[PDB]
C-alpha cells in the first residue's frame, strides 16, 4: 500500500522530478537567472520586469518569493522517496547497473537541490567556514508534523558532497538526454568543492569529469560551432558539450517566464547584459561570444543562448544547465588555487583559444581574477556570476558606464556595490514557511 514496488516506479518518480525541474519557477527560469541579475554583468531591463525585484534587491520578508523554496524541497522529497526504497527492491543481476544509475540520479539531484537552497538562503561557506545558517536537511518524507530548524551551511555541504560523491560512483557515463549522468554530477561536485575551498578535491573532480566526458565523445563546441550550437539537439552520436540539459518541448512547455522568453527582444525583454559587461566582452572584437548577443536596435543586448530547437518557439528553448566548459573553468580555478600554473594555463587556454584562436594565456602567471574574468564571459546568463564573486570574498561592483551600441541600458538600483556582508544577497525565508514552522529562523536584516 505504498508508491514504490518495482523499478519502473523509481523511473516514474524520476520523471516527475525532471518535470518539476523543467518549470520556469525551477531550472527553466528562476533558479537560473538568480545568479546573473543579482551580479554585475546582467540586469533587469526595467524595474517592472520579472527580474526587476531580484536585480534591485527589492524583496522583504512579507513579499519574498516562495517558489525556490517549495520547488527545491518538492524535488528533495521525491529524491528521498526513491532513496528510501530503491535498495529494498529485489531486481535481476542484469538490472543492477540500471538500478545503480537511477539511484545515482536521485542522489545527484538531491545534492544539486540542497546546494541551490544553501547558496540562495545561506551566506557563502568561506565567509565563516559554513558557520551561518543554511536550510533544513530533509532526508525522509514530510508529514503535517514536520517542523525542522535550519541546519548550518557546513552541515548542508556535508550532505551535498556526500550525495554528489556517491552519485559519481553510481551514475552511468553514457549520454542521457535530459537526465543527469556521471560527468554532469562530477562537474557540479567540482563546483561545490570550489565554493567550500576544497581545491584539491575540486581539481580532481573537474579533471576526471573532462577525461570521462571526452572519452564518451563530448567535446567543447568549436569556435565555428559556438554561435549556433545552443540550438542543436544533441544525441549520443553528437553530444556537444552539454552534460546536463533541461529539455523543454512545444508539447511540454515551461511557458513565457522561461529563459528562452526572458532573454529575447521577441519575448519579455526582461533581462539584458550591463554596459560594463558588453565593454569587457568587446575588448576583443574577435571573441566568438560576441556572436551570441542579440541586439534590440542600438538599445539593449540580450544573451541569445536559449535558442529554440527546430520548429520550436523561443519559449521552449532547452536549458544548458551544466556544460563541459564549466569543468574546464573549474579545473583552471582549482589549479590556480593549488599553485599549479602549468595546469591552470592548460585548462584556461582551451576556453580562451576556443573564443579566439589568436589569443593565449601561455607564459602568464594566472590569478583567480584572471580565471573569473574568463568564467564570466563564458557563463553569462547561465546563473553563476553573483555567486562567483561573493563566494570568493570579493565585492560585486555594478559600474554605471554608458555605451552607444546599447543606449537604453543603464543601471537603476540603490545597490551598486556589495559583498557577503550584504543581507540581501540571501532571499528571505518565505512567509509561508515562517508562518507554518515555528522552528524556522529568518535571515538577518529582514526581521
Which residues fall in the annotated binding site for Ca(2+)? 248, 312, 316, 318
CB closer to Ca ion out of 246 and 324: 246
The radius of gyration of the chain from alpha carbons, rounded to an integer in Å, stands at 21
Query: Nearer Cβ to Ca ion, position 78 or 248?
Result: 248
Tell the smallest beta-carbon distance from residue 247 to Ca ion (Å): 6
248 contributes a contact to Ca ion by CB under 5 A: yes
Number of residues near Ca ion (by CB under 5 A):
4
Instruction: Report the C-alpha dihedral over residues 111, 115, 118, 120, rounded to 10 degrees.
Output: -140
Shortest Cβ distance from residue 250 to Ca ion (Å)? 8
Taking the complex as a whole, the smallest distance from the CB of residue 22 to Ca ion amounts, in Å, to 10
Strand partners, 235: 238
Task: Give the separation between CA 217 and CA 9, rounded to whole angstroms.
Answer: 31
State whether residue 277 is helix, strand or coil. Answer: helix
Q: Which of residues 205-224 bind Ca ion (CB under 5 A)?
A: none
Residues numbered 318-377 forming contacts with Ca ion, rule: CB under 5 A:
318
**CB-wise, 248 or 304, nearer to Ca ion?**
248
CB 222 within 8 Å of CB 228: no
CB 172 within 8 A of CB 97: yes
H-assigned helices in 153-274:
153-170, 182-196, 199-215, 226-229, 259-262
175 — phi, psi (to 5°)? -55, 135
Nearer to Ca ion (CB atom), residue 253 or residue 330: 253
Task: Please give the grid coordinates belonging to residue 431.
Answer: 512567509
Q: How far apart are CA 336 and CA 95, in angstroms?
A: 42
Q: Which residues, other chains included, contact 250 with Cβ-Cβ below 8 Å and sequence gap of 6+?
A: 311, 312, 313, 316
> Residue 63 contacts by C-beta under 8 Å, 6 or more apart in sequence?
none
CA 12-209-175 angle, 5° bins: 40
Identify which range of 71-79, 247-255, 330-338, 347-355 contacts Ca ion by CB under 5 A.
247-255
Q: How far is the CB of 349 from Ca ion (least distance, A)?
A: 32
Residue among 24 and 318 whose Cβ is closer to Ca ion: 318
> Between residues 315 and 349, which has the closer beta carbon with respect to Ca ion?
315
| Cell numbers given for 394 | 570579493
Stretch in the footprint of Ca ion (CB under 5 A) among 97-105, 248-256, 290-298, 415-423: 248-256
**Smallest distance from the beta carbon of 139 to Ca ion, in angstroms?**
33
| Separation CA 97–CA 93 (nearest Å) | 9
Restricting to residues 282-321, which ones interact with Ca ion according to CB under 5 A?
309, 316, 318
Q: Closer to Ca ion at the Cβ: 14 or 317?
A: 317
For the CB of residue 71, give the shortest distance to Ca ion in the complex, in Å: 20
Q: How far is the CB of 378 from Ca ion (least distance, A)?
A: 22
Closest alpha carbon to 167 in 151, 153, 187: 187
Binding site as annotated, residues: 248, 312, 316, 318
- Report the interface residues with Ca ion, using CB under 5 A: 248, 309, 316, 318
Amino acid at each position: 500500500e505504498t508508491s514504490i514496488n518495482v523499478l519502473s516506479d523509481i523511473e516514474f518518480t524520476l520523471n516527475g522530478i525532471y518535470s518539476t525541474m523543467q518549470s520556469s519557477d525551477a531550472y527553466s527560469g528562476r533558479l537560473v537567472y538568480y545568479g546573473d541579475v543579482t551580479g554585475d554583468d546582467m540586469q533587469a531591463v526595467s524595474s517592472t520586469k520579472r527580474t526587476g525585484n531580484y536585480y534591485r534587491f527589492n524583496f522583504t520578508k512579507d513579499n519574498g518569493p516562495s517558489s525556490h523554496w517549495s520547488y527545491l524541497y518538492s524535488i528533495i522529497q521525491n529524491c528521498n522517496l526513491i532513496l528510501m526504497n530503491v535498495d529494498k527492491l529485489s531486481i535481476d543481476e542484469d538490472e543492477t547497473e540500471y538500478k545503480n544509475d537511477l539511484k545515482g540520479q536521485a542522489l545527484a539531484i538531491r545534492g544539486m537541490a540542497l546546494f541551490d537552497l544553501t547558496r540562495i538562503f545561506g551566506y557563502p561557506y568561506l565567509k565563516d567556514n559554513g558557520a551561518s545558517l543554511g536550510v533544513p536537511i530533509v532526508k525522509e518524507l514530510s508529514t503535517i508534523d514536520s517542523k525542522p530548524a535550519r541546519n548550518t551551511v557546513a552541515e548542508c555541504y556535508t550532505e551535498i558532497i556526500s550525495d554528489l560523491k556517491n552519485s559519481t560512483e553510481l551514475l552511468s557515463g553514457d549520454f542521457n538526454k535530459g537526465k543527469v549522468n556521471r560527468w554532469a554530477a562530477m562537474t557540479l561536485l567540482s563546483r561545490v568543492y570550489l565554493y567550500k575551498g576544497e581545491y584539491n578535491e575540486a581539481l580532481t573532480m573537474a579533471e576526471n569529469a573532462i577525461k570521462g566526458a571526452e572519452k564518451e565523445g563530448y567535446a567543447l563546441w568549436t569556435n565555428e560551432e559556438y554561435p549556433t550550437a545552443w540550438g542543436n539537439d544533441a544525441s549520443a552520436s553528437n553530444p556537444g558539450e552539454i552534460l546536463f540539459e533541461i529539455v523543454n518541448l512545444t508539447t511540454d512547455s515551461p511557458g513565457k517566464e522561461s529563459m528562452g522568453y526572458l532573454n529575447s527582444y521577441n519575448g519579455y525583454d526582461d533581462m539584458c547584459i550591463t554596459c560594463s559587461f558588453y565593454q569587457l566582452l568587446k575588448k576583443d572584437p574577435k571573441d566568438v561570444r560576441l556572436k551570441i548577443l542579440s541586439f534590440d536596435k542600438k538599445y539593449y543586448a540580450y544573451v541569445n543562448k536559449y535558442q529554440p530547437q527546430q520548429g520550436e518557439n523561443i519559449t521552449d528553448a532547452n536549458i544548458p544547465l551544466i556544460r563541459l566548459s564549466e569543468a574546464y573553468l573549474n579545473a583552471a580555478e582549482a589549479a590556480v588555487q593549488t599553485g599549479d600554473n602549468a595546469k591552470a594555463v592548460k585548462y584556461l587556454n582551451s576556453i580562451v583559444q576556443r573564443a579566439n584562436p589568436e589569443n593565449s594565456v601561455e607564459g602568464k602567471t594566472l590569478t583567480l581574477e584572471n580565471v573569473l574574468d574568463e568564467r564570466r564571459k563564458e557563463l553569462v546568463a547561465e546563473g553563476h556570476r553573483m555567486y562567483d564573486v561573493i563566494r570568493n570574498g570579493m565585492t560585486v561592483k555594478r559600474i554605471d558606464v554608458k555605451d552607444s551600441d546599447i543606449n537604453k541600458t543603464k543601471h537603476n538600483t540603490a545597490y551598486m556595490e556589495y559583498d557577503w556582508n550584504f543581507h540581501k544577497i540571501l532571499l528571505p525565508i518565505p512567509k509561508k514557511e515562517m508562518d507554518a514552522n515555528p522552528n524556522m529562523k529568518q535571515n538577518p536584516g529582514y526581521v
